[PDB]
Amino acid sequence: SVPSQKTYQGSYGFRLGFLHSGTAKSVTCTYSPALNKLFCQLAKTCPAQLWVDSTPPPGTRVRAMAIYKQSQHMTEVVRRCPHHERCSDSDGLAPPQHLIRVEGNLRAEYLDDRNTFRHSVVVPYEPPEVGSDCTTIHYNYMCYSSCMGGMNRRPILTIITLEDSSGNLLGRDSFEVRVCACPGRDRRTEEENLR
């Protein structure tokens, strides 16, 4: 099977938000609204904002999962390459095979679906803090898009789902991701090609 990637705000008006980091050669993570694509360096912080019109119930969670963007590769589980899954760089919670990790959240849970074998990381949804209007989750991508034997230059999409305590769908959003050496230059190049 293949997880749905259909945008769905749901009853709570759920949607993602990204910072405006620019395209300076030095940038480590930058989002392109025109391409709905996040460009980031290997294992660097990727801030993802969670916006809602109304607060969902306590027990609500937020899950992140990657799938290949190209339909001919959609059924293939996205995982870290043969090299990175063996580099012993786990933070003590993320299985070494998982591409996506959540930074600084001890309540993060990593799932290896017993039926689909797909990987995902889920955390409890926390309402915005006093003074804040959104909640932010910091993600890390643990392989380059170019890793041989892994993504192998194939583009991926990250699907973020808001779910209830049973795992039922409440909202969904998604974006393409390219993990590369120079996010600033690649974003500029791809946006130029689009122009």
Q: Binding site for Zn(2+): residue ranges?
A: 81, 84, 143, 147
The 3 state secondary structure assigned to 109-174 is EEEECCCCCCEEEEEECCCCCCCCCCEEEEEEECCCCCCCCCCCCCCEEEEEEEECCCCCEEEEEE
Beta strand 37-40 with 135-141 is unpaired
- Give helix then strand counts, H and E, for the chain: 1, 11
Q: Which of 40, 67, 143, 159 binds Zn ion (CB under 5 A)?
A: 143
Pick between residue 67 and residue 143 the one whose CB is nearest to Zn ion: 143
Pick between residue 121 and residue 147 the one whose CB is nearest to Zn ion: 147
Pick between residue 170 and residue 177 the one whose CB is nearest to Zn ion: 177
- Among the listed ranges 133-141, 145-153, 168-176, 181-189, the one in contact with Zn ion (CB under 5 A) is 145-153
Rounded distance between C-alpha atoms, residue 138 and residue 66, angstroms: 15
78 binds Zn ion (CB under 5 A): no
Footprint of Zn ion on 82-101 (CB under 5 A): 84
Binding residues: 81, 84, 143, 147
List contacts with Zn ion (CB under 5 A): 81, 84, 143, 147, 150
